[PDB]
Amino acid sequence: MNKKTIRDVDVRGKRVFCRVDFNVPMEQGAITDDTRIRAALPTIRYLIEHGAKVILASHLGRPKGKVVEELRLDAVAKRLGELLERPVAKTNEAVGDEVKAAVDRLNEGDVLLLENVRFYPGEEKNDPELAKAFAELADLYVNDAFGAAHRAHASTEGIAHYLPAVAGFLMEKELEVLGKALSNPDRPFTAIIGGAKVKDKIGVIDNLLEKVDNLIIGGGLAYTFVKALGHDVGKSLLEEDKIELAKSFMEKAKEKGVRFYMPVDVVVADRFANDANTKVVPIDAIPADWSALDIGPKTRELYRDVIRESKLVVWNGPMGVFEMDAFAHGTKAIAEALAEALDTYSVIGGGDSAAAVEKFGLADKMDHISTGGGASLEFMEGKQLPGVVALEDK
Numbered sequence: 001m002n003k004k005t006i007r008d009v010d011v012r013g014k015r016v017f018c019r020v021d022f023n024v025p026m027e028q029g030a031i032t033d034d035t036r037i038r039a040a041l042p043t044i045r046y047l048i049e050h051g052a053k054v055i056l057a058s059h060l061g062r063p064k065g066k067v068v069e070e071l072r073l074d075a076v077a078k079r080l081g082e083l084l085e086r087p088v089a090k091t092n093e094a095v096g097d098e099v100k101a102a103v104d105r106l107n108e109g110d111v112l113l114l115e116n117v118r119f120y121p122g123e124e125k126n127d128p129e130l131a132k133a134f135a136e137l138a139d140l141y142v143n144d145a146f147g148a149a150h151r152a153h154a155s156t157e158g159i160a161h162y163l164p165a166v167a168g169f170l171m172e173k174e175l176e177v178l179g180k181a182l183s184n185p186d187r188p189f190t191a192i193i194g195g196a197k198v199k200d201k202i203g204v205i206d207n208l209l210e211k212v213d214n215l216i217i218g219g220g221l222a223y224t225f226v227k228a229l230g231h232d233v234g235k236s237l238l239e240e241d242k243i244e245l246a247k248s249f250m251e252k253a254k255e256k257g258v259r260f261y262m263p264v265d266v267v268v269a270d271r272f273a274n275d276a277n278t279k280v281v282p283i284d285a286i287p288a289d290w291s292a293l294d295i296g297p298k299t300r301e302l303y304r305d306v307i308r309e310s311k312l313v314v315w316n317g318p319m320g321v322f323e324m325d326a327f328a329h330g331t332k333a334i335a336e337a338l339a340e341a342l343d344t345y346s347v348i349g350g351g352d353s354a355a356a357v358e359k360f361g362l363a364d365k366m367d368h369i370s371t372g373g374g375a376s377l378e379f380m381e382g383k384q385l386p387g388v389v390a391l392e393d394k
């Protein structure tokens with residue numbers, strides 16, 4: 001919230017450097033999923049329509065500061081032109097005289113895609129010299145890549161010290177929804193935290209406990225908490241070194257008046273495989289030589305009931321090993337409960353969690369699916385993302 005956007009500045013006839021996220025999956029030089037390109041169109045179309053000279057910048061993969069032929073942006077330029085139904089110029093460098101000549105040749109409404117910014121070693125180091133070379137190409141900077149704003153790189157932060165800097169439309173949606181969930185939530189406010197390791201979620205659980213009414217835990221994360229309560233977890237994922245941290249979090253929940261929910265039943269398997277023998281058991285009776293890979297039927301029911309009584313729900317992390325169909329039921333049940341809750345606003349964050357919802361075909365039934373991956377989690381921890389801080393306040 002409070003950042004200026006492209007709607008707040010006149011872009012007619014200005015050279016506009018726009019950081020976008022075109023880091024798409026490829027195989028054999030062909031794009032296999034263009035979702036991220038599609039997500040950038042609203043911003044891009046607005047700029048074209050209003051007469052900006054549009055300069056797009058993105059990274060693709062991890063070239064490590066050198067040219068990697070296979071990570072050039074030609075395929076993306078091609079695909080963008082198809083979607084816009086207008087040619088997209090594309091250079092083989094991102095700075096330098098050839099690039100200055102290409103920007104100079106742009107007319108109002110024209111689009112130019114620069115080569116992969118991570119071909120340059122100063123990008124990931126945030127070198128001011130690279131930042132200044134980028135800034136020399138334009139009049140204004142637009143940041144529409146929330147998934148890259150959590151690290152201070154020349155194209156996501158450095159350049160904003162030299163030009164007026166505003167948010168694109170995707171950036172604006174992420175800040176408004178996530179910002180409001182942390183700053184002024186609708187209540188009851190429930191957070192659902194799953195995934196594999198508590199190690200990965202320490203910051204998120206810590207910060208959400210200062211805000212929510214209810215905290216629900218699932219995934220492999222939950223077995224560290226069950227062990228903390230004195231129950232054996234058989235062969236389940238466990239982080240013994242975090243047992244004391246788990247007891248502190250439960251004590252923080254009590255002190256704050258938060259209702260804390262964890263599984264009452266689990267789906268256990270005799271082997272880590274889709275065709276393993278499985279059975280349902282209560283949480284205090286996990287067989288010593290079996291593994292719990294999903295939440296059970298009574299837990300799905302209980303979680304659905306809490307979701308139904310909440311006005312806002314933030315969910316990060318699968319409830320079980322959803323990659324295997326036999327252990328995907330708990331994850332599916334949470335997605336379906338959110339899709340069907342008439343007065344509950346749903347926010348989803350995390351790579352696997354977004355994938356899971358897409359996989360079940362429920363993405364359009366959710367209020368907001370964060371695009372930021374790791375940047376969404378860091379935002380939820382209460383961190384100040386460098387790319388966000390650099391943008392001007394309205």
Ligand SMILES: Nc1ncnc2c1ncn2[C@@H]1O[C@H](COP(=O)(O)OP(=O)(O)O)[C@@H](O)[C@H]1O
Nearest residue numbers: 195196219220293317319320321350351352353
């Ligand atoms: N009971 C479990 N045992 C082992 N791994 C689990 C369990 N429940 C969930 N996971 C795993 O959690 C992983 C997703 O966790 P995470 O990466 O933190 O989610 P996100 O990307 O949504 O933040 C998936 O690979 C899944 O198989």
Ligand SMILES: [Mg+2]
Nearest residue numbers: 350351352353
């Ligand atoms: Mg993940």
